[PDB]
Design a protein around this ligand. Structure first.
Ligand code: HEM
Ligand code: HEM
Ligand SMILES: Cc1cc(CCNCc2ccc3ccc(N)nc3c2)ccc1C#N
Ligand SMILES: Cc1cc(CCNCc2ccc3ccc(N)nc3c2)ccc1C#N
Ligand SMILES: C[C@H](O)[C@H](O)[C@H]1CNc2nc(N)[nH]c(=O)c2N1
Ligand SMILES: C[C@H](O)[C@H](O)[C@H]1CNc2nc(N)[nH]c(=O)c2N1
Ligand SMILES: [Zn+2]
Lengths: 407, 411
């Protein structure tokens, strides 16, 4: 019941006690492990509220104070009366920072405490949401010296009045299907790029068109808005060796800003809570550029490098993959946009595990996601045992809004 | 209960029903996942149902379930059990058992080869010298002048746990490791403890960087004995690079036959504590882990200097760039010397096909994603994008404690 984790490269062992707090379920059983699966009322609300307030007040060393008790009372009375309740700013901020801290799939959590929280609970319209988002984008970009942030729109009420950002990231490239069966732009966004067109967007039908925002307020129909171009920082991708690389015509954006997740704090559900940090290089170079069902550029780059693509055993894909990822890091750095490489990022995460085990008694972590999609075993996390479990406050997935929206 | 797995590259979805036959436990609960943890004397009481389960599988596979031959066998085994407290497998059953153990090995990417497996029955072995002989024949057969054949040698099953046969080596062929007084390690650091044991048992160590370790063999619960595999039976490959002519001067080589000798084979409740088996290498085992793990030969630095990479900051990806070349060299070297090897692209592609086949013909294929995905270039292999279910089936290969920790010395 008290669990040990071993790093097999360093022989270092940490004991985990924090998992004994875990509330939610994992999808695994004693019979079957599901670690590689991508997606595995008033009486309900009050224990949730209580668990949260308990940990909040413990976190400030006022556990079992009158302030604690009064607040427990105050929220308890409010749930009874209003069937829901509202978070004090302090609790909202603590809740958001802790949802990040609890994200077992996040390699960048060493940053968790330094998060800018933008309280957008006063928001009422899609225009309002647009304003809030532009301000977030500008703050977080910070002329390429990226700062982490989250903007939080009003909590769910009766589910019929949800705030939702329909995009998966605030900033993403469009995806169009071609007459000749192929796909121009980002294949992962073809369906969303259609819905935008279905609602009125006029697409430049280019390879790298920044998608417009589809913003839904108070359950209403979503509206289109274009992020001012001057607020969308982008990076042209060149290689510090291959002059021909620039001719490939690749760029990517600086701000990774996830907008489709659901934030849960003390039983309350924030269905619109866009957040952002900064990229780890492999996200773009390995996944976005080289995934088969994405921009899939391995062949072209290989041909430009004139590699023997006859046999798999030449490891030409591996060779190219490295070069591509060099270029990504090289470009971002050269243009002074914050980015971290997978070695630096994973090394920091080991340090962060050390801290968390020491000061919190553990750190939930999903090895399958923490280990980068290239060069796995030359990064320290590969050799690091990890325990995966579910802590709250949390970021959770939620259905795409189109499959749910009564128009 | 039916379960669905998805490949997120191809949208292919499969349904698992096979997991329903899983009895053993995973280490996970609905409250915690231990999928990345490395490590998760038997009564006649608990033994017969195991025997029965195994035999029902066996007879189903040969389409004789419910037959008079099936039933007489259950009877035979039952009686033999309650009289002798154990039982003997037929040759047919041992061969089925061995193959299926491999087949059920959820951490093995090479399982498309599972039904092609040479089983050597060594249950008549009684001594360590007898063991050495059987093992030599295994190495010669499996090596086959470079054209590798999968094989396993099966020594007698456990009786009272006091008469175990054990191979003390973790692999039949492996290089020594020597800790120096200056704290540095000469040879393979992973084998320092064992090398010390061998030295202690009288091995005269050449003390070089690639010394093939002597065999340390235990028969019938007796103290282990040392033997030297005939050099002419040990196929090695010097490592060179196709474009970098300085690579040969790095002084690297590796042995050709990966033969794991420290696992335990469970079949029908019986325990085979000595069951060395062998296949052939996937390049990354040597190229990524053996050479580039920090705790192993750790050659990234030296290789990087010689390629003249910018080693001052990690964001040049010098480590990644050297890793690739080292792996190119390993594959190139083996193919040039006509020694069987498979690259990680070919290996993972075939495993996906194998797995798809297993869902059709068998209703599932337990797989451990953490181990199946190669240690380099993960997401440009199809397995990275494949959802997998991981569960335990028997017959199976299990870990067991190192014999030096348990062994009772006779003197
Ligand atoms: C600041 C630097 C950050 C870095 C370097 C970083 C890195 C990463 C990476 C590489 C992933 C895997 C994403 C993927 O492969 O799709 C990830 C996942 C995740 N990150 Fe972080 N992240 C950062 C900031 C943040 C922030 C500010 C939040 C929220 C406040 C956050 C929450 C999450 C969550 C919830 C996941 C899991 C996402 C999912 O399940 O799809 N991260 N992070
Ligand atoms: C024929 C060529 C084969 C290839 C290319 C292959 C490939 C692999 C690889 C790469 C691993 C990961 C090992 C590691 O990273 O430490 C593995 C694991 C494993 N293989 Fe295979 N394999 C082959 C044949 C076999 C055979 C003949 C058997 C037994 C009859 C077998 C049984 C296993 C088992 C039980 C594991 C789990 C390793 C462990 O838990 O220590 N494999 N295989
Ligand atoms: C269901 C699903 C999930 C995902 C994970 C995406 N997660 C992005 C993400 C989230 C948070 C991040 C934080 C920082 C950062 N640099 N990148 C970050 C990237 C991909 C595809 C599907 C599908 N289908
Ligand atoms: C506890 C532990 C376990 C392991 C598993 C090694 N597995 C090797 C292996 C086993 C079977 C193989 C079959 C074929 C092949 N080509 N390589 C194969 C390699 C490694 C290190 C430690 C440690 N410490
Ligand atoms: C099948 C598997 O669960 C899936 O491909 C996962 C693997 N690990 C991942 N790891 C990260 N960081 N991001 C991902 O999208 C995935 N995909
Ligand atoms: C801690 C972690 O489970 C450990 O490093 C595992 C990860 N995946 C692996 N995969 C293979 N094939 N071989 C290994 O030794 C490991 N090690
Ligand atoms: Zn699990």
């Amino acid at each position: 019941r008290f669990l040990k984790v071993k790093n097999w490269e360093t022989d270092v062992v940490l004991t985990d006690t924090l998992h004994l707090k875990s509330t939610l379920e994992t999808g695994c059983t004693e019979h079957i492990c599901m670690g590689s699966i991508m997606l595995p009322t008033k009486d309900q609300l009050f224990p949730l509220a209580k668990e949260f307030l308990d940990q909040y007040y413990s976190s400030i060393k006022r556990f079992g104070s009158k302030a604690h008790m009064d607040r427990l009372e105050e929220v308890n009375k409010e749930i009874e009366s209003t069937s829901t309740y509202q978070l004090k700013d302090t609790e909202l901020i603590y809740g958001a920072k802790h949802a990040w801290r609890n994200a077992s799939r996040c390699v960048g959590r060493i940053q968790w405490s330094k998060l800018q929280v933008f309280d957008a609970r006063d928001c009422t319209t899609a225009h309002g949401m647009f304003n809030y988002i532009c301000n977030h984008v500008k703050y977080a970009t910070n002329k390429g010296n990226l700062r982490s942030a989250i903007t939080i729109f009003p909590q769910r009420t009766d589910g019929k009045h949800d705030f939702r950002v329909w995009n998966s990231q605030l900033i993403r490239y469009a995806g169009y299907k071609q007459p000749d069966g192929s796909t121009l732009g980002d294949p992962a966004n073809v369906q969303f790029t259609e819905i935008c067109i279905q609602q009125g967007w006029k697409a430049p039908r280019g390879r790298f068109d920044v998608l417009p925002l589809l913003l839904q307020a108070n359950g209403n129909d979503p509206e289109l808005f274009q992020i001012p171009p001057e607020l969308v920082l982008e990076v042209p991708i060149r290689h510090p060796k291959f002059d021909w690389f620039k001719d490939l015509g690749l760029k990517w954006y600086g701000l990774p800003a996830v907008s489709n997740m659901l934030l849960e704090i003390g039983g309350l559900e924030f269905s619109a809570c866009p957040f952002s940090g900064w990229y780890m290089g492999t996200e773009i170079g390995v996944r976005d550029y080289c995934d088969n069902s994405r921009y899939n550029i391995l062949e072209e780059v290989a041909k430009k490098m004139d590699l023997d693509m006859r046999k798999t055993s030449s490891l030409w894909k591996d060779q190219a993959l490295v070069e591509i990822n060099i270029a990504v890091l090289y470009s971002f750095q050269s243009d002074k946009v914050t980015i971290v490489d997978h070695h630096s990022a994973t090394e920091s995460f080991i340090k962060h595990m050390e801290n968390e085990y020491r000061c919190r008694g553990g750190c939930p972590a999903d090895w399958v996601w923490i280990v980068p999609p290239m060069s796995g075993s030359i990064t320290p996390v590969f050799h690091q045992e990890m325990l995966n479990y579910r802590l709250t406050p949390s970021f959770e997935y939620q259905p795409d809004p189109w499959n749910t929206h009564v128009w």
